[PDB]
């Protein structure tokens, strides 16, 4: 009868983050996976500026954790007030640093999976879009782009990048009409990877995370940056080439280069591959 | 039977002369109806048609009390009772595409029948497409007659259905239904024929109920993805507007 | 049970020495069939396979009377009767040159996935213009990251221009096995066909393509390419426009 | 002293009512001259000026016997004898539509900067295909940020495709005044000419352009555009390729 | 006879940065301008990892300083050891977080002017490339892309972005041959905005900073992001659109939007501009 | 007088049959010399020339002991004593452009004379260009004869000299000297005629003295700016290579 996606036995707190008020941060007991969650279900997990600061902190920390390979981004719930479920309802209307959180997710050399456990609206919908993968609660996920309703707009990863997932016609519809969609509808459109039973949402996220983590970390990083490079232009190039430079630094040819400086370099042993 | 509800529309003053195109303003809504008016010839456009279409769309672009354009074809044919949105060629249609592309408002294509050749490319370039379950027919006959739309007609179609489906549509030039195109991603929704314009109006109303400013920015944001420097010009152009509305811009 | 109609195909002259690949021309149609001929190792390719694939494809590209290439895999495996289009590089970078060959040739290339399409064989399918797949036996699986390798070009990024960024990332990040119907619903497979009729449907598709203005078909292909291939795409497309401007004056 | 040779130009029929702009056709050449006619306010444009500029340019675009537009400013100022091509918007967004008109028309547009080119007038010069400038009197100055405005499109970003990112950023971020020779050395001005011969040189350039295959010239312009104009650039270029494919079969 | 570009009277330290060892950080006594400088002239101002951390900190701080409009990035000198001058000689060979410093400079909504007071080599040359503007010492600036000499490479803002300044032929030459160029040569090629007398390098930087700071801050920010968008693809779009969203939030039309939410919105008063 | 120093070069084994092209390996350096060999006709290429040029460049691409390609024209003409790099058209040259573009080594064009039409476009697509102060002549005659290179010949030229200069070069088709092209940004350096190949060799040696791996990555990094998804394929392709050389790639 318990419906909560959260398995209390599978997560441990992360040292140094006891002061978090708007966000919860866990590490899996076994897996190289973390759980990052909005913690204001009482207001449909809207973020206020302090929420965004905490979210940046946490994701930055996870990015820099060598033993963490996958990030699960979700929202806690339900609301104690009305039992309503929310991933994130966007900006607390009662902010623009959220764009920095977008780039943090876009640029981190690890797969970020959004788990949409309820309402994903406005800024909250856009966070889901920018994530690498999305899994959504069959019963409770609700996607609604309310930006134009309130005279706001996400003209970047929220809208344009949505079009690289569902195509130009559907992305336009989602934003121009701001209708409410289910998990299954978004899956059919191409913005949701798979639909899961509410109670199994995080269980499935964990299975996906494990299938990801079982692969070459190196290849996974190159892959993400390769997907990014399609659309991220010169920044995408910087990141992908950045990873390629890291690879180069490991070859004997690069060791000879640095040895010489510390002669003349000898490139004789190294072929002109083609 | 007919999608067109004559009670809902009023002719636009100043266009009593149109022969290939009809032009209506909704009686209550900030919505216009622009329609091919040569059902007798499958709503194929001749040069005069294009002039009129440009003229009317341009007029609608410049009407500050009009948020949405429904673009469709009148019917049925008096000759054979068939349905056609637009069957293609009988100033240039390329200029009509850009006008639709660049205008700071949502253009919804209502495919009420055959949409072939240039008529199909018109549907592709519109922001949204709604299609008749019974009578919408999507057919790219370009390669069949040794012609091609190498711009919004084809490449932009790939930004809606993906590279595999878009190549199929053009290379084979098969005919597709509303529901097939909906599944592939070129059609937003399928509607019963008689309700096609009723649904269009409902979509237009939901669009018109939003901040017009955010809607304009969003459109150009979607265009900017693919329109390169032109897209930048249009989006930045709006941003400059927002700027002039600022106390900082005033002091300068 | 087998997709290949032996009566329908004739060997191409000048290719009697092929060992890893088969190359047929249709008895009536302007269509050729190029296939991996190593069912024994699930049609995995070795350097010699690539060499042959490239020769064959190049020859097909230059043949003025051929309009469509059908790219597939022979089978079943004599060892276990298992079907495979191509399982990628032999675990026992010329392939990238074959991708470009397929990408750049002024002719439609249709991949017929008759079985396992894994790793580089999956990437081969992605780069093709159209894909038709066997309902019963086509299995799509991107195993790159499993072996610590990756295709950072047409294998991955271009797939995203077919199924979208969410699905493309899933296909690679998880490396799961998908059927013909799943891929068809995602946008990377044009149509699912019954195993036995896969090449038959392939020929019907080739015939509809071959029936249209061939000049139009070339311009359209490069127009679709131009969207993603930047300056190289511009070169190929302008190139054909130049060809058009050499018939008048 | 004045760049305009009155003997060389004839008024265009249907434009007797022009007040902010002058529109001439060359007596012999397939070249027209379009000019700001408000030397009194340093050729600053008001909404009515834009309307006229667009009409004139549109008419020129549609004229089958005109191959080159020369865009310039009349002068000197009757008030102080100061020269100005165009000083931008009248401090006392149709202009963006004029940019696109210049950008998209299948004809070469040459800007002749005979004096001050500031703000939007500077941006007009940037968007033109070629620029020739007066050694003595051309002054290039991007004043946008001074007045809290900006051109975020062809005025700024496109300038970077002429002078590079460092120089383009400098021109806008500092808003300094540059001469013809400086701009020529930076890459935004094609050639510097003596004030008096500016239009003469303009006509010589137009004549060399007008002398080549006009179909080639159109394809080349859109090819250059295609580099930066994305899908819109693809449309225009493909469009002309389509035109080429309508002369054979 | 004193040749040092540094005017000791014109700069004040920045509170909270007394612990800096590898980097110096000053605020101008009058102007909304800061001075950020490499402080290891003894090793030609090569950065080690701790150097990059400090540089990120400082630039991040300057980005977030509302009263600071322009950043002057340079190197201190001369070397006490041999009197040699250096802006920055790149990676301390005796790191890859420098890519994050690149993005910080690329993305900050303020003009960063590099003042090349000596050697700019490897990673140090690339930092200069990514800056919005470059001013260079006539006597002492030396530009040398040594990356390929040591088997390394900057495949992003260091190389490709250089091509958007000097063109494809010159950028290729600079990297493939790794020759040494003067201020004047780089100016002619298009990567240096102006050449200044060594002693007047920072004086000129200050004049440029003042001409920049006298303009609309708003327009300057939009302009930078507009220049970026040419090449930065979707990330560039995110940033430019991000600034446009900030503008929108200021209009009456956006106030009505948020007012409503806090039902129906009324858009009657707001025109459909075109 | 002549740029060519016969003492410095040895014919390449296997190409004793070439008639339109000469092909040399330097006697010490990892550098080859590829040259048009029809000075009698201004080094214009006919179809057979293109086949040979492709063949030789392809061979050089595949030679792991060759770092740099010097591409030039032999002369002077025996008929009139003039100089020509390549004057354009007399498998396809477009395929030669891509081979030059995609090969994982630096191709330096030595313009020793007239470089016109397709010959000019060849110089544009090479990584670096050195030109004879006295005799290099750059002329885009494309529009003059109703032809155009709408790819690397023109668009890519704009990524070297900027949009204004590139448009001038093509629209007017004027003739430029080495020094003019150097100032505009299409020519890396100008050399005295007799020293042209000597300087080429010095540039090649400086290139060859660097990590071949970093050089390949850098080239594709420069290409990736403009070559879109093709550029991505080539750059990623190299990165995959670096990957396979890894202990992680081995364990997999
Ligand atoms: C996400 C939306 C569409 C879901 O609406 P729903 O009807 O299910 O719940 P609400 O009653 O609208 O919201 C629950 C409580 O949280 C407040 N709240 C919700 N979102 C925000 C926000 N982005 N910024 C500030 N506050 C928010 C509501 O006010 C409510 O509080 P109470 O006044 O009932 O105690 C909808 O939530 C939305 O779009 N916003
Ligand atoms: C396409 C994939 C998933 C096929 O897997 P499947 O389980 O169906 O067949 P296997 O039993 O794993 O292997 C079949 C035989 O073919 C060889 N082989 C398969 N793929 C490759 C490859 N990419 N490179 C080199 N060889 C491959 C195997 O050696 C196997 O032979 P046996 O060891 O069973 O005799 C993968
Ligand atoms: C192009 C710029 C820099 C010209 O500056 P300059 O110092 O040479 O002439 P001014 O004395 O500043 O002004 C000339 C007359 O023209 C009007 N004017 C100039 N530019 C504009 C503009 N962009 N919008 C509206 N009017 C403009 C001035 O009003 C001035 O008239 P007087 O006030 O002197 O009678 C700038
Ligand atoms: C920038 C380069 C080309 C300038 O070389 P220069 O001959 O003028 O000075 P050096 O003697 O090479 O260098 C001065 C001291 O600093 C060390 N050093 C310089 N750059 C680095 C670096 N990137 N990483 C680590 N150390 C560096 C030198 O070793 C020298 O120390 P001493 O051993 O003489 O005490 C040249 O500096 C370069 O490219 N690197």
From Swiss-Prot, chains A, E:
CDD domains: crotonase-like (cd06558). Belongs to the enoyl-CoA hydratase/isomerase family. MenB subfamily. It catalyses: 2-succinylbenzoyl-CoA + H(+) = 1,4-dihydroxy-2-naphthoyl-CoA + H2O. Pathway: Quinol/quinone metabolism; 1,4-dihydroxy-2-naphthoate biosynthesis; 1,4-dihydroxy-2-naphthoate from chorismate: step 6/7; Quinol/quinone metabolism; menaquinone biosynthesis. Substrate binds at residues 44, 89-93, 119-123, 146, 152, 249. GO terms for molecular function: 1,4-dihydroxy-2-naphthoyl-CoA synthase activity. InterPro entries: ClpP/crotonase-like_dom_sf, DHNA-CoA_synthase_MenB, Enoyl-CoA_hydra/iso, Enoyl-CoA_hydra_C. The gene is menB. Its EC number is 4.1.3.36. GO terms for biological process: menaquinone biosynthetic process. The lineage of its organism: Bacteria, Bacillati, Actinomycetota, Actinomycetes, Mycobacteriales. The record marks 147, 249 as: Important for catalysis. Keywords: Lyase, Menaquinone biosynthesis. This is 1,4-dihydroxy-2-naphthoyl-CoA synthase. It is an enzyme of class 4 (lyase). Converts o-succinylbenzoyl-CoA (OSB-CoA) to 1,4-dihydroxy-2-naphthoyl-CoA (DHNA-CoA).
Curated annotation (Swiss-Prot), chains B, F:
It comes from the Bacteria. It is an enzyme of class 4 (lyase). Substrate binds at residues 42, 87-90, 114-118, 141, 147, 244. Its EC number is 4.1.3.36. InterPro entries: ClpP/crotonase-like_dom_sf, DHNA-CoA_synthase_MenB, Enoyl-CoA_hydra/iso, Enoyl-CoA_hydra_C. Pathway: Quinol/quinone metabolism; 1,4-dihydroxy-2-naphthoate biosynthesis; 1,4-dihydroxy-2-naphthoate from chorismate: step 6/7; Quinol/quinone metabolism; menaquinone biosynthesis. GO terms for molecular function: 1,4-dihydroxy-2-naphthoyl-CoA synthase activity. GO terms for biological process: menaquinone biosynthetic process. It catalyses: 2-succinylbenzoyl-CoA + H(+) = 1,4-dihydroxy-2-naphthoyl-CoA + H2O. The keyword Cell inner membrane does not apply. SUPFAM superfamilies: ClpP/crotonase. Converts o-succinylbenzoyl-CoA (OSB-CoA) to 1,4-dihydroxy-2-naphthoyl-CoA (DHNA-CoA). This is 1,4-dihydroxy-2-naphthoyl-CoA synthase. It comes from Mycobacterium tuberculosis (strain CDC 1551 / Oshkosh).
